[PDB]
Design a protein around this ligand. Structure first.
Ligand SMILES: *[C@@H]1O[C@H](CO)[C@@H](O[C@@H]2O[C@H](CO)[C@@H](O[C@@H]3O[C@H](CO)[C@@H](O)[C@H](O)[C@@H]3O)[C@H](O)[C@H]2NC(C)=O)[C@H](O)[C@H]1NC(C)=O
Ligand SMILES: *[C@@H]1O[C@H](CO)[C@@H](O[C@@H]2O[C@H](CO)[C@@H](O)[C@H](O)[C@H]2NC(C)=O)[C@H](O)[C@H]1NC(C)=O
Ligand SMILES: *C/C=C(C)/C=C\C=C(C)\C=C\C1=C(C)CCCC1(C)C
Ligand SMILES: CCCCCCCS[C@@H]1O[C@H](CO)[C@@H](O)[C@H](O)[C@H]1O
Ligand SMILES: CCCCCCCS[C@@H]1O[C@H](CO)[C@@H](O)[C@H](O)[C@H]1O
Ligand SMILES: *C(=O)CCCCCCCCCCCCCCC
Ligand SMILES: *C(=O)CCCCCCCCCCCCCCC
Ligand SMILES: C=CC/C=C/C=C/CCCCCCCCC
Ligand SMILES: CC(=O)/C=C/C1=C(C)CCCC1(C)C
Ligand SMILES: [Hg+2]
Ligand SMILES: [Hg+2]
Ligand SMILES: [Hg+2]
Ligand SMILES: [Zn+2]
Ligand SMILES: [Zn+2]
Ligand SMILES: [Zn+2]
Ligand SMILES: [Zn+2]
Length: 348
């Protein structure tokens, strides 16, 4: 056999030398150099140190500034929240695991590690669908006099969680299961064994279709619409009203957010589809380790795109960090928001 199947795991190493141990009972240093596990640990340490403050700050500024209530401001607030669950929900265990070379917390630690990475990745995938919809409704404007309200945005947010939970929770209650991957310091969906006893195969097809292919189809089809209507081409203020030039900034960001999502999950998705379609083939530990741990960056890149591609939010963050206020130079050069500085309402 090319690997060592356990009743609870599947180590990507031969046990012909009888040196393979359950990833829930002993270190896996026989799979790789011990310094490489330290690498993983240092890496997770740094991700947590980056992920916590970046997402918390994003969360804090959105709340402290009353006028930050567009659908985009909601989705990113929702993302930072999801990202914080990733950091404290799963990254804390993946760091603890990497430090010991195996899941000392047994299957529970594996469920935490896998559930939160999945939840987070999916909340983002579905958040992209919503954003793609919202972006469609404002650019191609399917209605005549319509505008999304805080109510609709909260609906979208509630939606992403329902969809994400529909993908990450089944494995905690009998449909498929979370299992250690690569160097066995991270956990994911069981693509390794057929374990009919928990219907692993049907869940995988369900995950790749309902929670990967379909959403991407929607997203790319919707984009194909904003091919003619709007475009990445943006000049100075106006074009068709300054409300058009500013509307373009948000769309440019949403498109980048998709590029990033793909760059972060296509390799993990790719190696997972392979394994699933080559169960028992001869692949080693590093195979899934690299894409799996790289995908964990999904917990901090969104807020970075937000702050770097949204003049308004960035100015609000500066105003928050510089205490009282003092946005210096630009300030925004457009409408702004906060809790007492200049959140003055400006309708009619
Ligand atoms: C890879 O092959 C080796 C050798 O066949 C497997 O080692 C065996 O592992 C089991 C469980 O870890 C050992 O059983 C132990 O028996 C004592 C009874 O004295 C019990 O108190 C312990 O709780 C445990 O059940 C067994 O002795 C050991 N045999 C060896 C080293 O020759 C190893 O499990 C295989 N890797 C897999 C399939 O994960
Ligand atoms: C162990 O892994 C090897 C290589 O991944 C598997 O051998 C391949 O099997 C497929 C389908 O049977 C063939 O198309 C390839 O040509 C084989 N490659 C080799 C080794 O030349 C092998 O089947 C696996 N053993 C199992 C299933 O336990
Ligand atoms: C480090 C931990 C990881 C990567 C844990 C598990 C993650 C998954 C099973 C993620 C699945 C998928 C997502 C989030 C994005 C679209 C493709 C997908 C279905 C492979
Ligand atoms: C970017 C998505 C990644 C696509 C997945 C490529 C699987 S490729 C696969 O990998 C095995 C293990 O290293 C090799 O032994 C085998 O020769 C190779 O063809
Ligand atoms: C860190 C993610 C950002 C890097 C990806 C390239 C985004 S693109 C970049 O966005 C700026 C603000 O929206 C625009 O002013 C600029 O013209 C445009 O090229
Ligand atoms: C205004 O006074 C000048 C800008 C100074 C901002 C310095 C940037 C440091 C960012 C640290 C924020 C940490 C977030 C807190 C998480 C608890
Ligand atoms: C409100 O306006 C406070 C600003 C918060 C930004 C944090 C700025 C940190 C101050 C610089 C510290 C200098 C480093 C010296 C270390 C000995
Ligand atoms: C088109 C791409 C937009 C890309 C954006 C990226 C923003 C990224 C943050 C990634 C943080 C990784 C940290 C590793 C610390 C060892
Ligand atoms: C795919 C990848 O980046 C590395 C693949 C591998 C190498 C180089 C060494 C042993 C086996 C494994 C883990 C398959
Ligand atoms: Hg779109
Ligand atoms: Hg990424
Ligand atoms: Hg602002
Ligand atoms: Zn079983
Ligand atoms: Zn989902
Ligand atoms: Zn199969
Ligand atoms: Zn500026």
């Amino acid at each position: 056999m090319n690997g060592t199947e356990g009743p609870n795991f599947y180590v990507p190493f031969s046990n012909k030398t009888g040196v393979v141990r359950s990833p829930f009972e002993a270190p896996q240093y026989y799979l790789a150099e011990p310094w490489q596990f330290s690498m993983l640990a240092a890496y997770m340490f740094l991700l947590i140190m980056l992920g916590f403050p970046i997402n918390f700050l994003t969360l804090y500024v959105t709340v402290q500034h009353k006028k930050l209530r567009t659908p985009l401001n909601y989705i990113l607030l929702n993302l930072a929240v999801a990202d914080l669950f990733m950091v404290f929900g799963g990254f804390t265990t993946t760091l603890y695991t990497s430090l010991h070379g195996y899941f000392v917390f047994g299957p529970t630690g594996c469920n935490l590690e896998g559930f939160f990475a999945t939840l987070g990745g999916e909340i983002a995938l579905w958040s992209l669908v919503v954003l793609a919809i919202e972006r469609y409704v404002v650019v191609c404007k399917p209605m005549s006099n319509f505008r999304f309200g805080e109510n609709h945005a909260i609906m979208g947010v509630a939606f992403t969680w329902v969809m994400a939970l529909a993908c990450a929770a089944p494995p905690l209650v009998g449909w498929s299961r979370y299992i250690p991957e690569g160097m066995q310091c991270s956990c994911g969906i069981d693509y390794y064994t057929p374990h009919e006893e928990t219907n692993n195969e049907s869940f995988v097809i369900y995950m790749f279709v309902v929670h990967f292919i379909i959403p991407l189809i929607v997203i790319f089809f919707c984009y194909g619409q904003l091919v003619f209507t709007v475009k990445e081409a943006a000049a100075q203020q106006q074009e068709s009203a300054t409300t058009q030039k500013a509307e373009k900034e948000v769309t440019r960001m949403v498109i980048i957010m998709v590029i990033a999502f793909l760059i972060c999950w296509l390799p993990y998705a790719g190696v997972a589809f392979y394994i699933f379609t080559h169960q028992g083939s001869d692949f080693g530990p590093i195979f899934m380790t690299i894409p799996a741990f790289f995908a964990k960056t999904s917990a901090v890149y969104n807020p970075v795109i937000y702050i770097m591609m949204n003049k308004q939010f960035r100015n609000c963050m500066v105003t928050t960090l510089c205490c009282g206020k003092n946005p210096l130079g630009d300030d925004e050069a457009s409408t702004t928001v906060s809790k007492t500085e200049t959140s003055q309402v400006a309708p009619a």
